[PDB]
Write a structure and sequence with these properties.
homodimer, Heme iron utilization protein-like fold, six-stranded antiparallel β-sheet, globular, Heme_Transport_Util_sf (chains A, B)
């Protein structure tokens, strides 16, 4: 909106430069924080690796994932990474918050009105394919992430993976 | 360390003033963010309501709580409050991180080297007594919180509560 200055644009150009350069380690998105916000590193991944749906699809996507079986819920801050396996429960909504409680260890409150985008990330993570759904906030960071689980043989669960790909493809 | 200025001290005094004043709603600590950091509102609660142990007690306290049975783990950010019921699993440590994984839905990684204090909070929460253990970071915020559970009758679980009080009293 506001006019840009030569230095500001230059600062931007250099920022993107560091972004691309930092991606050198092709296979953690947050770690690649040499420069800017996670959503900026996501927009720089190979085409198809980061497919976003509009925030208004929040309820449809959540309902969809509730049928995926046991997934892995992950919330991360600079002090902790909490990983909780479980089925996604039904949620009720009031004043911008999506209150989730059901027969699952995954419970609490999601500030749904803070969601700016929902990005399906399908990329190599340290040698292996990783599939997850990132609910992004207005600041370009992940509010939380839902990961597709792996089986005994360490491979992405077939049935769940198919549903992820199916949903993700629809937004591509 | 560095010398204070009249305005800076005044700013501080006014800050504490807002803190105390905001506490008007005697029974959420974070909500009381009219002015400063959570640890500052904690240090303002009635004597005994917030008892802190030194960060070096991290392992002893975690081991202690692992014997408390099913507790409630809570991590909160501006976008989400994740509440996970479960037993605390054993953890291993490497490079400042406490990696917790076991027979429990509570799993992941805690940045143990970021812990500055562990505060036992025993206070009225909206009419009723609430007991929890806050692992604080250097910035005066809670990294995560472990809450004592309630039973069918909605009262704090007797056996668990006793262990909490016992441990907390020892630091008072």
């Amino acid at each position: 909106a506001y006019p840009m200055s030569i230095a500001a644009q230059k600062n931007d150009d250099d920022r993107q430069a560091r972004a691309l350069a930092a991606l050198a380690e092709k296979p953690e998105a947050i770690a690649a924080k040499a420069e800017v916000a996670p959503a900026e590193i996501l927009a720089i991944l190979p085409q198809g690796a980061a497919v976003s749906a509009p925030a208004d699809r929040f309820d449809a996507i959540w309902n969809e994932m509730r049928g995926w079986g046991e997934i892995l819920m992950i919330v991360q801050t600079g002090d902790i990474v909490l990983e909780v396996p479980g089925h996604l429960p039904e949620g009720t909504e009031s004043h911008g918050w999506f209150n989730i409680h059901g027969d699952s260890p995954i419970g609490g409150h999601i500030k749904k009105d803070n969601c700016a985008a929902i990005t399906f990330v399908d990329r190599g993570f340290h040698g292996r394919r990783s599939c997850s759904v990132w609910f992004m906030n207005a600041a370009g960071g992940a509010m939380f992430k839902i990961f597709v689980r792996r089986d005994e043989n360490k491979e992405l669960l077939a049935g769940q993976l198919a549903k992820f790909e199916e949903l993700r493809d629809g937004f591509r």
